[PDB]
Amino acid sequence: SELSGPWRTVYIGSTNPEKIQENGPFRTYFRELVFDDEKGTVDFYFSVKRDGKCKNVHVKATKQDDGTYVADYEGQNVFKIVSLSRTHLVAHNINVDKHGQTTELTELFVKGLNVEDEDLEKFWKLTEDKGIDKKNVVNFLENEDCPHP
Numbered sequence: 001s002e003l004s005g006p007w008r009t010v011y012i013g014s015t016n017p018e019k020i021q022e023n024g025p026f027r028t029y030f031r032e033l034v035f036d037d038e039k040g041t042v043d044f045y046f047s048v049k050r051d052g053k054c055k056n057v058h059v060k061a062t063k064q065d066d067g068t069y070v071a072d073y074e075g076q077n078v079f080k081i082v083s084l085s086r087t088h089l090v091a092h093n094i095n096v097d098k099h100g101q102t103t104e105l106t107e108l109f110v111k112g113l114n115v116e117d118e119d120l121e122k123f124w125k126l127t128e129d130k131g132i133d134k135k136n137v138v139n140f141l142e143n144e145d146c147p148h149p
């Protein structure tokens with residue numbers, strides 16, 4: 001709940017590179033998370049480029065009894081937060097598309113001044129553990145390349 005505020009994306013890894021390349025659905029630049037402990041929800045606010053245009057998107061995730069979350073976005077998503085504090089969030093997600101095809105993703109998001117070594121280590125271990133190659137991780141300091149007509 002004190003966890004709500006201006007989160008930013010650091011890295012996202014994918015088993016399918018096409019999903020996180022420019023114009024891909026999972027190239028999500030976070031702006032804000034809102035945690036609601038009484039409802040067991042997390043609201044995500046982020047920008048993503050699709051079909052050559054940038055949109056500000058909102059997705060609501062709901063905590064399950066087993067501790068994992070579900071959310072509908074570009075398919076159906078089931079995810080686990082593996083590490084969470086006032087300054088970092090490390091998570092892995094399974095996305096299921098309309099054809100039953102699955103993509104596994106890993107993510108590091110932060111709300112502190114810096115990215116701590118401890119943050120990075122958890123992210124990179126998880127990414128290796130899920131079989132994600134280093135070339136299939138995106139660095140979100142890259143230009144989103146939004147048009148400005």
Ligand SMILES: C=C(CCCC)CCC(=C)CC(=O)O
Binds near residue numbers: 012026028059079093
């Ligand atoms: C799948 C992603 C990005 C989600 C963008 C909607 C990274 C790994 C996660 C488990 C993220 C998450 O849902 O917190």
